[PDB]
Structures are given as C-alpha cells and as structure tokens.
Amino acid sequence: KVVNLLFEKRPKNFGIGQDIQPKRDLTRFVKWPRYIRLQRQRAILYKRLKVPPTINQFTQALDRQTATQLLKLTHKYRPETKQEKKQRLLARAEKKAAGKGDVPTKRPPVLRAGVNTVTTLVENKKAQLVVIAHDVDPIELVVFLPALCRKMGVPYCIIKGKARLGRLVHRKTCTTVAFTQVNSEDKGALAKLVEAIRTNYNDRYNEIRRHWGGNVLGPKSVARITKLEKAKAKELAT
Amino acid sequence: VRPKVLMRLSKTKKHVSRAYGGSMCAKCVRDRIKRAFLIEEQKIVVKVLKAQAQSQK
Amino acid sequence: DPGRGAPLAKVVFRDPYRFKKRTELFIAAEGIHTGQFVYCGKKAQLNIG
Amino acid sequence: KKIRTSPTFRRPKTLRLRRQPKYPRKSAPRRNKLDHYAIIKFPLTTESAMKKIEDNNTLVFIVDVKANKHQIKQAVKKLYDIDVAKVNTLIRPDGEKKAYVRLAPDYDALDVANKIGII
RNA sequence: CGGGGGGGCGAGCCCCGAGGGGCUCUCGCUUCUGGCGCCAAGCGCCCGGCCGCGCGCCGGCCGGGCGCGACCCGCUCCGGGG
RNA sequence: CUCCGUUGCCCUCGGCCGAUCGAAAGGGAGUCGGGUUCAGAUCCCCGAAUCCGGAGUGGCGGAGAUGGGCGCCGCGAGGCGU
Numbered sequence: 001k002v003v004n005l006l007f008e009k010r011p012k013n014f015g016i017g018q019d020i021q022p023k024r025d026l027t028r029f030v031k032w033p034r035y036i037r038l039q040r041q042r043a044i045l046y047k048r049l050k051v052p053p054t055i056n057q058f059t060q061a062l063d064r065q066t067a068t069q070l071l072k073l074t075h076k077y078r079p080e081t082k083q084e085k086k087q088r089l090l091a092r093a094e095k096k097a098a099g100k101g102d103v104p105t106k107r108p109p110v111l112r113a114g115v116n117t118v119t120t121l122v123e124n125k126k127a128q129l130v131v132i133a134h135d136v137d138p139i140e141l142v143v144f145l146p147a148l149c150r151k152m153g154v155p156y157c158i159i160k161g162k163a164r165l166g167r168l169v170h171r172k173t174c175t176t177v178a179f180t181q182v183n184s185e186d187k188g189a190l191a192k193l194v195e196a197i198r199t200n201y202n203d204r205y206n207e208i209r210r211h212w213g214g215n216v217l218g219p220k221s222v223a224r225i226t227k228l229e230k231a232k233a234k235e236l237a238t
Numbered sequence: 239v240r241p242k243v244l245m246r247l248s249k250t251k252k253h254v255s256r257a258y259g260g261s262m263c264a265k266c267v268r269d270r271i272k273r274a275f276l277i278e279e280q281k282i283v284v285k286v287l288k289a290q291a292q293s294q295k
Numbered sequence: 296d297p298g299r300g301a302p303l304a305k306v307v308f309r310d311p312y313r314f315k316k317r318t319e320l321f322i323a324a325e326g327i328h329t330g331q332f333v334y335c336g337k338k339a340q341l342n343i344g
Numbered sequence: 345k346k347i348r349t350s351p352t353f354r355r356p357k358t359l360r361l362r363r364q365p366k367y368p369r370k371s372a373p374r375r376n377k378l379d380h381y382a383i384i385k386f387p388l389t390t391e392s393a394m395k396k397i398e399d400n401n402t403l404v405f406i407v408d409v410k411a412n413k414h415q416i417k418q419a420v421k422k423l424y425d426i427d428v429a430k431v432n433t434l435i436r437p438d439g440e441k442k443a444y445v446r447l448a449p450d451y452d453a454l455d456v457a458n459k460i461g462i463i
Numbered sequence: 464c465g466g467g468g469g470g471g472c473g474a475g476c477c478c479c480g481a482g483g484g485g486c487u488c489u490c491g492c493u494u495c496u497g498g499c500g501c502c503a504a505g506c507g508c509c510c511g512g513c514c515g516c517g518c519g520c521c522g523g524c525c526g527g528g529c530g531c532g533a534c535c536c537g538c539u540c541c542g543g544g545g
Numbered sequence: 546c547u548c549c550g551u552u553g554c555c556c557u558c559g560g561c562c563g564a565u566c567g568a569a570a571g572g573g574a575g576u577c578g579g580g581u582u583c584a585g586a587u588c589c590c591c592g593a594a595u596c597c598g599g600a601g602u603g604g605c606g607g608a609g610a611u612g613g614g615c616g617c618c619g620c621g622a623g624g625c626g627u
C-alpha cells in the first residue's frame with residue numbers, strides 16, 4: 001500500500017448552522033461605488049424605458065463580416081499621420097527647387113472624419129459611404145445623420161466603436177467617417193459594400209422610423225409574470 | 239495586582255499550568271472536558287441511529 | 296437597562312460566515328433563563344424565546 | 345476571474361511616487377541660529393550661585409529660552425572644554441532660562457569659573 | 464436573490480421493464496446537556512528543480528501551480544411601498 | 546553584498562466606526578529616608594531604590610540539555626563507532 005494510513009478525509013459540510021461557510025464569488029452582492037452603480041443602471045434604463053426610433057437605430061449595427069471589410073478598406077486611406085505629413089511638404093520643398101515642381105499634385109483620396117465635415121459633403125451629394133459610430137456620448141451629434149443620408153440617396157452604415165473608428169484617423173474617438181472618392185482598383189470592393197449596406201439600412205427606413213426599442217422587463221420580473229401564465233394556462237388547458 | 243504591572247511579572251505568576259490555566263476555574267474546565275465528551279459521543283449515537291433509520295427504510 | 300421596565304438578554308450566536316461570535320440584546324421573553332438555547336429563523340420550533 | 349470574496353469594494357492601492365523637484369523651493373538653508381554662542385548668554389555670579397559653585401560643583405548659567413537640556417550640555421561642553429554630569433533648567437520670572445550645570449567628579453568648578461572670568 | 468439546472472435520504476402524483484425514468488414536494492442536511500468549529504482536507508490535473516529506473520506526462524526525493532470539493536446563467540444589493 | 550539591514554515592485558492578509566479636541570479632583574507603569582537655604586526642595590546634596598524604552602553585533606552566566614539504547618574497547622572508573 002503506497003498510502004500512509006494517516007491521510008484520512010476530514011470532509012466539511014456547509015449546511016445552515018453547520019461548519020463555517022467558505023468563500024464564493026459575490027460580484028452580485030457587492031457595494032459598488034456610486035459611479036459603477038450609476039453606469040450599470042444607466043444601461044438598464046436604456047432597456048426598461050420605451051426608446052425612440054432615432055436613438056434606437058443606433059443599437060442595431062453592422063456584423064463581424066461586413067465591418068471587417070470596411071475596416072480593411074479604410075486601411076488604404078488613413079489620413080496622413082504626423083511625421084507622415086512632414087515628408088509630404090518636405091519632399092515638395094526639395095522637388096520644387098530641383099526637379100520642376102509645379103506642386104499641384106493629385107491629393108490621393110482619403111477619409112473624412114468630423115461631423116460638420118461629413119454633413120456638409122452629404123448635403124452636397126459628395127460621399128459614397130458614411131460610417132457612423134453607435135456610442136457617441138451626446139447622441140444629439142448623430143441623431144439626425146441617418147435621415148439626412150437616405151434623403152440624399154447616400155448609403156450609410158452603423159459600425160460599433162467610436163474608438164476603433166477613431167483609430168483609422170489617428171485620434172482617440174471619431175463619430176463618423178466617409179469615402180468621397182476611391183482609387184480605381186479599390187472601386188470593386190467599394191461598390192460591393194455599398195449594395196450590401198443600403199439593402200440593410202437605406203431601403204429600410206419605414207421599418208426603422210416605426211420601431212421602438214425598449215419596454216422589456218427585467219428577467220427577475222419576466223420569470224414572475226410568465227409563471228402566472230403557466231397557472232392561467234393550466235387552469236383552462238387541462 | 240493593577241493591570242499594567244502584569245508587564246513586569248513573570249510567566250508563572252500570571253497563569254497556572256493546566257489546560258485553560260489562568261483563564262478558567264478548573265471546576266468549569268473539568269466540566270468542559272466531560273461535556274465535550276458526550277456531545278461527541280451522542281453525535282456518534284445519532285449517527286448510527288440515523289444510519290440504521292436509513293438502513294431500515 | 297435603566298429607563299426600561301423590561302430586562303434585556305445578551306444572546307450569543309456565532310457568525311456563520313467568519314470565525315467570530317456575534318452578540319445581541321433581545322428583549323427577554325418571560326421564562327427565558329440563563330443557559331437556555333434560543334433558536335432563530337424559519338425552521339425554528341414554536342416555544343418560548 | 346479574480347473572484348470577490350468580500351462584499352465591500354475597498355479602493356485599490358495605487359502607486360504613488362516621491363517628490364522630484366525641478367528647483368529647490370527656497371535657495372539656501374536657513375543658517376542655524378541656536379548656536380554655541382547664542383545658547384549661552386552669560387553665567388550668573390549671584391552670592392547664591394557662587395555658594396552653588398564651590399559646594400555642589402555646578403555652574404549657574406543664563407541660557408536662551410529655546411534651549412534643550414541636551415543642547416545646553418553640548419554647548420557648555422563645546423566652549424569651556426568641560427564635561428557635564430547632568431543639567432537642571434528652570435525659567436526665572438522675567439523669562440530668562442537659568443541652567444544649573446553639574447560638572448563630572450573629575451572636573452572642578454572653582455577652577456573653570458576663573459577661566460570664564462566669574463568669581 | 465430570481466430563474467434554472469445538480470444531488471438525493473424521502474413523500475404525493477405521472478410513467479415504468481421493477482432496472483429505472485419524468486412531474487410535484489422536501490431539502491439544501493444543525494433541537495436533551497453554560498462543549499468545540501476559521502486560515503481545507505480529500506481527490507483530480509498539471510509544471511519547476513533533484514534522484515532513481517531510463518522511453519520519460521515510469522517510479523522515488525524536494526518544491527510549486529490550477530480545477531472539483533464549494534452546481535450553471537443573469538439586469539435592478541437585498542426586502543416593503545409606487 | 547557573508548548575512549543582515551534598507552528600500553522598489555509583484556502576490557498574500559487586514560471588519561469597524563470615525564478627521565481631531567475634551568479631566569493640574571475621573572482613567573493613567575515608576576522615589577523613598579536623611580541632610581541643606583535668607584528664599585527652593587519626594588526637584589539641590591548624600592544614601593538607598595525603581596519604572597519604561599533601547600541592548601543590534603547579543604554584554605555575561607543560567608535555562609532550552611545533555612539522556613537512553615545498541616555495538617565494541619577498558620580489571621574498573623571509563624573511551625570510541627553507530
């Protein structure tokens with residue numbers, strides 16, 4: 001027997017009033033500070049109340065398949081980083097005084113970031129695709145944009161993350177983004193995203209404008225109200 | 239003797255060499271021994287009466 | 296306690312979460328004596344205290 | 345998955361560094377002002393002080409009111425090349441701090457009194 | 464806590480092949496005595512060093528780590544109002 | 546840079562309960578006898594003490610501890626090996 005007879009068991013039993021209880025997770029019983037307790041039951045009021053459609057369209061969003069292509073298309077068009085803008089001017093100050101620089105050169109097509117840059121060139125019918133982040137903090141800034149879009153016949157999409165959309169342009173956040181022109185070779189992928197988007201967003205407004213997005217109770221409550229509908233069912237179903 | 243004096247005194251002046259010595263009175267120690275006995279023993283007795291009540295049923 | 300006609304009772308449970316001994320002050324029901332076992336809760340049985 | 349065993353949320357213990365001043369806040373250190381020549385004002389020559397000298401082997405001093413017994417000992421030791429057994433301070437009415445300084449047994453007070461000019 | 468699901472001594476009912484399974488309940492196990500009660504056992508799975516067999520996820524010596532034990536998911540900390 | 550100290554960071558543990566003030570009669574370790582001045586003395590001097598803190602390197606002894614067994618060698622006190 002390779003077992004020393006002394007190793008016995010001493011198994012504990014945590015019944016009520018029995019041996020002391022051990023430590024389990026309690027994340028659902030913790031006195032969280034007044035800023036966590038705030039931001040969690042902010043995301044609840046955002047489900048319990050009856051949400052207006054224009055704020056609600058920003059909940060339904062793009063998917064893993066569509067958004068990854070968009071975020072791939074933009075990686076060929078990111079506006080010049082700093083120290084990347086430096087060599088666009090510096091190379092033109094040396095090319096001008098040495099090798100026949102007229103300096104009008106064709107500014108290669110790039111994105112456009114801000115709201116009051118995009119809403120000008122959508123009001124102008126000058127944008128192929130508009131990308132909207134769904135989590136802008138004052139939603140006032142983008143509440144209108146989707147309706148302004150489809151009224152001008154411009155395909156708009158709603159992607160997730162004002163951060164990763166504000167990561168193509170080199171900033172922290174960025175609410176919108178827009179392709180005005182595209183390279184001729186990149187035209188195939190641009191026309192492919194476009195039709196796949198406006199089938200889901202632009203040609204849908206009479207389903208979006210008439211869609212309220214809350215009025216769901218908490219599951220502690222749904223389990224109670226539906227438990228009285230198995231009583232009322234089994235009262236006149238048996 | 240006044241409590242802050244117990245710092246000067248020696249270990250044997252402050253206790254008496256037994257179980258619970260210097261804190262319990264040895265008339266309540268010799269009870270806490272033969273009370274901690276039969277509490278366990280009649281937990282064994284209920285353990286086998288519970289093991290025979292489930293062996294019968 | 297002063298200012299009250301009822302006597303209080305220091306009843307010692309033991310906290311079933313941390314090794315310690317919670318002690319309370321129940322308004323003593325008539326019949327309670329020292330050394331009695333006071334049981335509490337839903338599954339307790341119906342007798343004095 | 346670091347489970348929360350206690351139901352309280354005590355704030356996490358953040359790192360905090362030390363002061364790394366780009367400049368000193370004041371330029372130079374304030375030169376010390378309780379020196380060995382400003383801690384001893386002048387020795388008393390009272391008839392009840394000389395009677396203290398020859399008999400008790402002490403010396404009576406008037407001493408700046410901010411002085412410790414350790415401070416008084418390290419100055420009397422620094423000036424008169426002396427060594428001190430124990431220092432006894434008081435505060436006269438009029439607020440000047442007397443200090444009876446008991447010299448070690450090997451040292452004579454009736455002699456060091458002549459060096460400091462009192463008698 | 465609310466749902467769920469585990470468990471099962473056991474009871475009601477349903478099914479059953481008498482092995483068992485499903486629904487319902489019970490429980491979350493402590494009531495004779497002025498006792499003791501925590502900082503984990505046990506099991507499992509790994510890894511570091513050392514020794515031995517040497518094929519070393521073999522076996523020994525020394526030293527650690529994670530999982531079960533201590534069921535899973537959640538959206539208001541739990542109750543009482545409105 | 547032995548070993549110890551110090552500090553930096555990482556893991557681990559920690560309920561409180563209120564920043565702080567409030568008694569020269571409450572709580573609060575430990576000083577007594579003799580002598581001394583013109584005026585001070587449990588405060589100076591002499592002689593006996595005493596508490597608290599430090600005592601690291603530990604200042605010194607004492608305690609922890611100095612057995613028993615077996616095996617030899619020795620007349621024996623005893624010595625060695627395990």
Ligand SMILES: [Mg+2]
Nearest residue numbers: 250251253254
């Ligand atoms: Mg004794």
Ligand SMILES: [Mg+2]
Nearest residue numbers: 565566567568
């Ligand atoms: Mg105070």
